[PDB]
Design a protein around this ligand. Structure first.
Ligand SMILES: *[C@@H]1O[C@H](CO[C@@H]2O[C@@H](C)[C@@H](O)[C@@H](O)[C@@H]2O)[C@@H](O[C@@H]2O[C@H](CO)[C@@H](O)[C@H](O)[C@H]2NC(C)=O)[C@H](O)[C@H]1NC(C)=O
Ligand SMILES: *[C@@H]1O[C@H](CO[C@@H]2O[C@@H](C)[C@@H](O)[C@@H](O)[C@@H]2O)[C@@H](O[C@@H]2O[C@H](CO)[C@@H](O)[C@H](O)[C@H]2NC(C)=O)[C@H](O)[C@H]1NC(C)=O
Ligand SMILES: *[C@@H]1O[C@H](CO[C@@H]2O[C@@H](C)[C@@H](O)[C@@H](O)[C@@H]2O)[C@@H](O[C@@H]2O[C@H](CO)[C@@H](O)[C@H](O)[C@H]2NC(C)=O)[C@H](O)[C@H]1NC(C)=O
Ligand SMILES: NC(=O)c1cc[n+](COC[n+]2ccccc2/C=N/O)cc1
Ligand SMILES: NC(=O)c1cc[n+](COC[n+]2ccccc2/C=N/O)cc1
Ligand SMILES: *[C@@H]1O[C@H](CO)[C@@H](O)[C@H](O)[C@H]1NC(C)=O
Ligand SMILES: *[C@@H]1O[C@H](CO)[C@@H](O)[C@H](O)[C@H]1NC(C)=O
Ligand SMILES: *[P@](=O)(/N=C(\C)N(CC)CC)OCC
Ligand SMILES: CCO[P@@H](=O)/N=C(\C)N(CC)CC
Lengths: 530, 532
C-alpha cells in the first residue's frame, strides 16, 4: 500500500485515493464522516460528532448527496444537469472531502473550505464543477468541502422547539469547520490559515458564519461569490418559519404540540417532505426558497443587516463579487414569457407581471417604484430592453445590491474588501446567448475545470482559469489577491472600486450599480417601514 | 386729428397714438378701461364691465400697475428691476392695450392676447419686455394685453363668500377676453381667430381658461411658456385659501374669523400697502416657488382640479404650443435656497442640497423628500458641489415647471389636440444674471416680443435674426395653428414620440422626451406615494 494515502484523524484511520491531474498527482480523501448520520430520531436535530471507529474507513469516493429536490425543467440539458445530484440521495450524508498535494505537505499549508450553493434546498460537494484537484495541484493548498443538510432537513424551524430548532444545516457546516481545526493538520493543512469561500447560498452561509461568534473563530478569511447573508432570500423570521413548518406538516398528513408535530414528521419518508417543500411558499415567485436560515437570536442574534451595520470588522479581509448577468438564469423558472429556447422578448405586460414574481410579497407602491426605476420612459415597451430590465430587477434585488451593501459596510467598518465582476462567457456555455454570463458560471474557472483535458475550453480560457486560481489562492495565503502588472485595489465605500475579470487584463471600475442599488439599499427600506 | 388713431368701441370713443418702430409705424391704444375700478367697496369682487362714456378717451399711455409687492433682493440690478412695476401702483388698474398695424388692416387679422406672469402676486402689461409694437410691425398681427389684479386683491378667497369669492383676477382676464370678442373688429382684428399666450403664472392662467368653459369660447388657440395650470404652485384648495385669507386679516387686525361679510368689510378699510406688507407671512412654510394668493379650486371657475380636468377633457379642434427654457429652476434658488447667490458660483454642500430640497419641494412627507434625494443624487459623486448645484436647479425646475408642462402636453395630444413643444436654449448676450444659471426662467420672452429689434439695446445681429425667427413661429401658429411656413420642420408632440425642438441660433433640432426619466417620477410615482 501507500503511506501517502493513509491518514489517521482523531476518529480513526482513513484510506484515500491518488488522483490524476494534467500537472501531476494529488491526494484526495473523499467521504470522510464528520457527523453521526442524522436519521430517524435525529432528523431535524443538530449534528452530533462522529463517534470513533476501529479499522480503516474507505475514503476513496464521494458519499451520498443529502436528500433534495431534483430539477426537471430541461431534462438532460447540460446547463441544469450539472447542478443535479450525481450520487444516490440519503439522509446519511454528513461527509466531507479533503484534497491535498501528492506527496502530502511537510510544512503547514493554507486551507480552503468550500460551501456549495443551491438555494438552501439543493447542492452537493460531489458535483464535477466543484472538483478540487486542479486548484490543489496548481496552487499547493489544502481543499476541504462538506455536505450539509438542505431543504426541510437542514432548515425546518419550529422556533423555540428543541425537536426542530432550525439552522442545523448551518450547524453541519460549523461542525465540519470544527473538524478542520482538529484534523486538517493530519493532512498538512494549517489550521491557523483557513479561508472560507462559497457561492450563492454558500456565499450566504459564509457570511452567516462571519456574523456568528462561535463560527468566527474557525476561519480567518472569507470569499463570497454572488451571494450575501443580507439577501432578501437568505433568512426568514421566526413567525414565517413556524408557518411554513406547520403547513408542510399539514401537506403530508401531520398531525398541537411541537413535540407531536415533529414526531409525526419524523415518520415520513424523506422523499415525501421533498415533494411538498415548495407548496408552502406564500406566493408564486422566482428566487425565493421555503426552508432557509431563521433569525432566532441563537445562531444569528439579530438580522444579518443589523449585525453588519453594528459589527467591528477590523482585521478581516474579504473577497466578494458577482457575475455580469445575475438575473438571467432565474427568469426561465417562472417569469412569464421566458425560456432558454428563444430570445424571450417579453411584452410590457409580461415585464410588469415578472416584476411581481421577482420582487414578491411587497406592497403595490413598492412594486411600482421598481417599475419607475427600471423603465426607460423613452422606450417603455421595447421587448429587448424589457427583457434585460427584468433581469436587472431580479439580479440587483437578489444578488448585486445585497453584496454591494455588505462590501460597503464591511469596508467602512475595518475590513479590507476586494470586489470583482466576472464578465467572461465560457465558450462551452450551453445557455442561450441572451443570458450573457449567467449566475454560477464563474465557479468552473475558479476550480480550474478548463484545465481538464477532457473538455473543449480554449487556450486563452485555460490561462484565464490559472489567473483566477492565482487570485483566489493569493487571497487565501495573504488576504491580498495581488502578487508582488495591473493591480487590484481594495473596494471602499467612497471610491467603490472593483475589477473586471475576463480574458483581458484587469480593468478598474467604479460602482457596483450605485444608482440601482441606492434604490434597493437606501430608499425602498424606508418605503416599507412607512 | 388722424382718423386711423380714432376707434369707437361699444363703450365710447378712443384716441390712440402712432408708434414708431424700426420697421415702420404701429397704432397703439394703451390704457383702455375695460372694467370699473375695483376700489373701496369693490375690492375683492368680480369686475364689473366699464360703463359707457361720453367724449373721447385718450388711450395714449400705459395705465397704473395693479397693487403689488416690489422685489428688493438685488436693488438696482437689471435682471430683477425689469420685472418690477414701471408705473405707479394703484387699485385703479383694470386697463388693456391694443397694438395694430398702421394703417389699420383692411381685412380681419388674427389676434394675439398676452397674459403676463409673476407668481399671481406681481407683473404688469406695461413692462418694457412686453412691448407689442415689434410683433405687430414684423408679423401684421393685432396684439392685446391686459392688466389683472394680483396678490390678495386678485386672489384672496373666502370660498363660498359673496364679498370675497376668489379668482377675481382670473375674471379680470376673462372680462378682457369678452372685451376682445366684442371690440377687436373695430381695430381690424378677427374675433374668430384669437390666440391666447402667456408665461409662468400667465401660462398657468392660459391653461385655466382652457379648462373653464365660459372662457374656452373666447379664444381658439393657446400658447403656454414655462407654466401650466397643474403645477403644484398654481392653485390651492378651498380650505387652505380660507386659512391664508383669515390669517392675513388677523395679521392686519380684522376682526378686532366669524362673519365673512364683516371680515372682508374690515379688510377693505385697510390701506393697499398694508395688505401687501403682510401677504407673505401667511405661507405655511419657508419655500421658493410658493405664492400666498393664487387661483382656488372652488367648483366655479374650475369645476375640479386642473389635473382632473386635463385628464377628463376632450381637446379635439384645439392647437397648443408649449415649452420651457433650458434651466427653469436656477432663477428661484437665489430667493431662499441655502448657499445660493447670483454674486458667486453657489457651489453648495451636501447638507445645503438636502436643506434646499425641502425648500424647493415644500410640505411633502419625509418619505417623499427621500425619494427626491434618491433620483437626483449621483451616488458615485454624491457630494460634488457643482453636480449638487445643477441637481437642485433641476429639482425645482422639474417639480414646478417642466414636469407639469410635460404632463399637460402629453394628455392634450392623446386626447385630440395638436401639440407643438420647444426648449429655449439661447442665453442672451445681454443677460445680467450669472452664467451658472444658464438660460433662466423667463428670458425667452424678450425674443418672442422682438425686443432685440429695439435700436437702443445691444443685441447682436444674430440675436435679431433669431427674434425674427421666433416671431414668425408664434405668428404662424396664431394664424394657422402650425408654426411651420411651408426649411427644417417642427413635428407635433405626441405621447409616444414626445418630440420637441430646440430654439437657439442654430437651425431647428428635433429631440425626444421632456426630461422623461425625471418627469415620470414627478408625474407617475410620487402622486401615489403621497396617496399612501
Ligand atoms: C419563447 O418561449 C416562451 C416559452 O414557451 C415555451 O417554450 C417555447 C420554446 C415553446 O416550446 C412553447 O410551446 C413553450 O410553452 C414563450 O412564452 C410563453 O410562456 C407562457 C408562460 O411562461 C405560456 O403561457 C405561453 O403559451 C408562451 N407563449 C407561447 C407558447 O407562444 C414565448 O412566447 C416565446 N417567445 C416568442 C414566441 O417570441
Ligand atoms: C353676517 O353679516 C351680514 C351683514 O351684517 C350687517 O352688518 C353688520 C355690521 C351688522 O352689525 C348688522 O348691522 C347687519 O346684519 C348679515 O347679512 C345682513 O342681514 C341683515 C338681515 O338679515 C340685513 O339687514 C343686512 O343688510 C345683511 N347684510 C348683508 C347681506 O351684507 C348676515 O346675516 C350675517 N351672517 C350671520 C350668520 O349672522
Ligand atoms: C455665496 O453667496 C452666498 C450668499 O451670501 C450672500 O451673498 C454673498 C455674495 C456675500 O455677499 C454674502 O456676504 C451674502 O450674505 C453665501 O451664503 C451665505 O454665507 C454667509 C457667510 O459667508 C452666511 O452668513 C449667510 O447666511 C449665507 N446665506 C445663505 C443664503 O446661505 C455663500 O457662502 C457664498 N459662497 C462662498 C462664500 O463660497
Ligand atoms: N421540493 C420542490 O417541490 C421544489 C420545487 C422547486 N424547487 C426550486 O425551484 C426550481 N428552481 C430551480 C432553480 C432556480 C429556480 C427555480 C425555481 N424558481 O421559481 C425546489 C423544490
Ligand atoms: N408680500 C410680500 O411680502 C412678498 C414677499 C416676497 N414675494 C416674492 O418673494 C420673492 N420671490 C421672487 C421670485 C420668485 C420667488 C420669490 C419668492 N418665493 O418664496 C412676494 C410678496
Ligand atoms: C468537444 O467537442 C466534441 C465535438 O465532436 C464533442 O463531441 C465533445 O462532447 C465536446 N466535449 C465536451 C462538450 O466536453
Ligand atoms: C449699448 O452699448 C452702448 C455702448 O456703451 C451703451 O452706450 C448703451 O447704453 C448700451 N445700451 C443699453 C445698455 O441698453
Ligand atoms: P412666474 O410667474 N414668472 C416669473 C418668476 N417671472 C416672469 C414675470 C420673473 C422671471 O413665477 C413662477 C410661477
Ligand atoms: C440564492 C439562490 O442561488 P444559489 O443557491 N446557486 C444556484 C441557484 N446555482 C445554480 C446555478 C449554483 C449552485
Amino acid at each position: 500500500e501507500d503511506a501517502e494515502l493513509l491518514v489517521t484523524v482523531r476518529g480513526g484511520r482513513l484510506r484515500g485515493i491518488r488522483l490524476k491531474t494534467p500537472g501531476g498527482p494529488v491526494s484526495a480523501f473523499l467521504g470522510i464522516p464528520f457527523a453521526e448520520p442524522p436519521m430517524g430520531p435525529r432528523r431535524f436535530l443538530p449534528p452530533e460528532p462522529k463517534q470513533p471507529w476501529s479499522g480503516v474507513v474507505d475514503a476513496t469516493t464521494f458519499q451520498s448527496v443529502c436528500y433534495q429536490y431534483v430539477d426537471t425543467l430541461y431534462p438532460g440539458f447540460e446547463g441544469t444537469e450539472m447542478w443535479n445530484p450525481n450520487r444516490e440521495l440519503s439522509e446519511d450524508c454528513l461527509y466531507l472531502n479533503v484534497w491535498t498535494p501528492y506527496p502530502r505537505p511537510t510544512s503547514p499549508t493554507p486551507v480552503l473550505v468550500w460551501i456549495y450553493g443551491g438555494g438552501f434546498y439543493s447542492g452537493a460537494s460531489s458535483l464535477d464543477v466543484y472538483d478540487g484537484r486542479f486548484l490543489v495541484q496548481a496552487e499547493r493548498t489544502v481543499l476541504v468541502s462538506m455536505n450539509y443538510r438542505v431543504g426541510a432537513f437542514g432548515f425546518l424551524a419550529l422556533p423555540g422547539s428543541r425537536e426542530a430548532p432550525g439552522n442545523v444545516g448551518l450547524l453541519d457546516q460549523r461542525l465540519a469547520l470544527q473538524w478542520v481545526q482538529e484534523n486538517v493538520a493530519a493532512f498538512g493543512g494549517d489550521p491557523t490559515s483557513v479561508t472560507l469561500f462559497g457561492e450563492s447560498a454558500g456565499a450566504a452561509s459564509v457570511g452567516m458564519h462571519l456574523l456568528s461568534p462561535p463560527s468566527r473563530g474557525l476561519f480567518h478569511r472569507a470569499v463570497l461569490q454572488s451571494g450575501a447573508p443580507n439577501g432578501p432570500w437568505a433568512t426568514v423570521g421566526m413567525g414565517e418559519a413556524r408557518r411554513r413548518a406547520t403547513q408542510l406538516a399539514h401537506l403530508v398528513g401531520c398531525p398541537g404540540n411541537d413535540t407531536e408535530l415533529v414526531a409525526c414528521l419524523r415518520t415520513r419518508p424523506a422523499q415525501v417532505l421533498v415533494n411538498h417543500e415548495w407548496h408552502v411558499l406564500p406566493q408564486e415567485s422566482v428566487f425565493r426558497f421555503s426552508f432557509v436560515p431563521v433569525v432566532d437570536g441563537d445562531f444569528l442574534s439579530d438580522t444579518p443587516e443589523a449585525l453588519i451595520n453594528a459589527g467591528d470588522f477590523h482585521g478581516l479581509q474579504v473577497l466578494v463579487g458577482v457575475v455580469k448577468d445575475e438575473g438571467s438564469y432565474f427568469l426561465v423558472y417562472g417569469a412569464p414569457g421566458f425560456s432558454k429556447d428563444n430570445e424571450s422578448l417579453i411584452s410590457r405586460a409580461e415585464f410588469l407581471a415578472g416584476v411581481r414574481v421577482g420582487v414578491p410579497q411587497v406592497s403595490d407602491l413598492a412594486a411600482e417604484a421598481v417599475v419607475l426605476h427600471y423603465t426607460d420612459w423613452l422606450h417603455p415597451e421595447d421587448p429587448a430592453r424589457l427583457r434585460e430590465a427584468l433581469s436587472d430587477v431580479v439580479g440587483d434585488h437578489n444578488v448585486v445590491c445585497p453584496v454591494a451593501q455588505l462590501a460597503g459596510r464591511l469596508a467602512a467598518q475595518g475590513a479590507r474588501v476586494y470586489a470583482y465582476v466576472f464578465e467572461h462567457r465560457a465558450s462551452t456555455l450551453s445557455w442561450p446567448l441572451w443570458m450573457g454570463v449567467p449566475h454560477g458560471y464563474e465557479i468552473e474557472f475558479i476550480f480550474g475545470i478548463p484545465l481538464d483535458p477532457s473538455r473543449n475550453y480554449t487556450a486563452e480560457e485555460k490561462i484565464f482559469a490559472q489567473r483566477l486560481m492565482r487570485y483566489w489562492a493569493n487571497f487565501a495565503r495573504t488576504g491580498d489577491p495581488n502578487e508582488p502588472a495591473p493591480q487590484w485595489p481594495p473596494y471602499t465605500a467612497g471610491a467603490q472600486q472593483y475589477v473586471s475579470l475576463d480574458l483581458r487584463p484587469l480593468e478598474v471600475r467604479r460602482g457596483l450599480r450605485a444608482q440601482a442599488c441606492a434604490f434597493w439599499n437606501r430608499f425602498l427600506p424606508k418605503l416599507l417601514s412607512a
